[PDB]
Amino acid sequence: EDTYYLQVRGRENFEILMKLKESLELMELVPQPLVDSYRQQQQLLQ
Amino acid sequence: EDTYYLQVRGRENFEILMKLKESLELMELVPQPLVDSYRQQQQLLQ
Amino acid sequence: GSDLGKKLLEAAQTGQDDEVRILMANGADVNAMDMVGMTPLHLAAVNGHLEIVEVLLKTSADVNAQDYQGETPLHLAAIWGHLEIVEVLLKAGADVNANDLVGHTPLHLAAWSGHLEIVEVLLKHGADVNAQDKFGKTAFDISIDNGNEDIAEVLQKAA
Amino acid sequence: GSDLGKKLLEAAQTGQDDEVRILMANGADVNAMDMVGMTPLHLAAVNGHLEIVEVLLKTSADVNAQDYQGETPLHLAAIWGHLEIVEVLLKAGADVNANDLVGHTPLHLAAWSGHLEIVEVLLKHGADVNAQDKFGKTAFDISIDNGNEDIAEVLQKAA
Amino acid sequence: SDDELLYLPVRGRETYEMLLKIKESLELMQYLPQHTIETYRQQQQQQHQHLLQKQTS
């Protein structure tokens, strides 16, 4: 549906991108209220 | 040789990535001495 | 913060009951915080590990410990729908009306997730139905938004 | 910094001689700086626009203007191999021994690029062959590194 | 006891915002139950059934 393929040179590069792919794909599963608490937290630290 | 293909959803997203593709591909053509001057400049501003 | 502290956070997260008991026996910090400020008790509540929650509640671990977002274990048991864990946190002295940074009570978060039995338990322990978040919204207002009609009507009956 | 200033930077960069003359007639700042601190004169030197360089050198524009990296128009004419531009900058009073932030002289940068005629011109105007960059390297040391044997031997003969 | 609080100096809005989206995604994973992770990871293992290849002709 909205799946995207890419290609990367370098094992270290692939590993970083797999770490972030994971964390970015999982973000959709984080309840919005906890996201809102979190962004509140970041703004307070400014 | 070391050319890589990727796929992006969203015209605004494609435009940003084309801007950076340009600037990152052109970086190889910047003489190293001017790069070194530049990185010196950034360190001085710390 | 400490090696045993991180192992205990991870054992609590992953439901390693024997590991938890053994780390604690060896002096692991029960107030260890992960990168979002969660304690093993928070992580046991998130991941639904009732036995681990009961174990941690026999220690000095604060049942009302706040992570960096102001979430208590009761907020997170509530949002993830862990009814048994909600019940024992409340028995162990969980503040039913604890506020996170955007003014969510456990009731807001049970409302958000559509966890009916948990809304019922929170009301039973004196959840405040008239509490407003940062954005001026009650548990009710959020049940409405998220199309939780069961919970909408339970909340209106109580206000 | 100004609208005409940016247009003049871009006209100088892109070799739009008539545009340059017209922007200047209309009062465009000849000391306008781009995002790396380059003046129209810098950009005319980079891009090899001899006529535009000659035009700008009939104004108050500083022939020894430094960008944020300490590069003068003579550094950049040198590195990009614009012999005619090097010659007129030197005639217009370009400091042959100007230092950028990492201690490169125009001679270092002509050495780096393997521009033989330009090394010759820089020596002729009194380039200092014994000048060391941040990293302790002469024009000579850099000709060696970059396999510029012609220029290596010209530099050794002069030291 | 808390994780060490380090600070990252970032030149510019754009790099900052980008690093913020990244940090946010890495941190907020902590709030996910393992049932959710394990569901994700089985979804991912099943993507491997059909592997990526560069096509030709």
Added chain:
Amino acid sequence: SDDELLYLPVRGRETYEMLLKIKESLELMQYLPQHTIETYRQQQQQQHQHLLQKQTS
């Protein structure tokens, strides 16, 4: 007259470094002659001769 000097606050080393590689690449383009740009851009126009497509079967 100089470009406006803005500052971008960035939480963390990693986002900072990333935004720095980006900014650097965007700024240092200024040092390239148009002959070099035009060479690049003709190289790029010629990549279009052979267009990218998702292959099937």
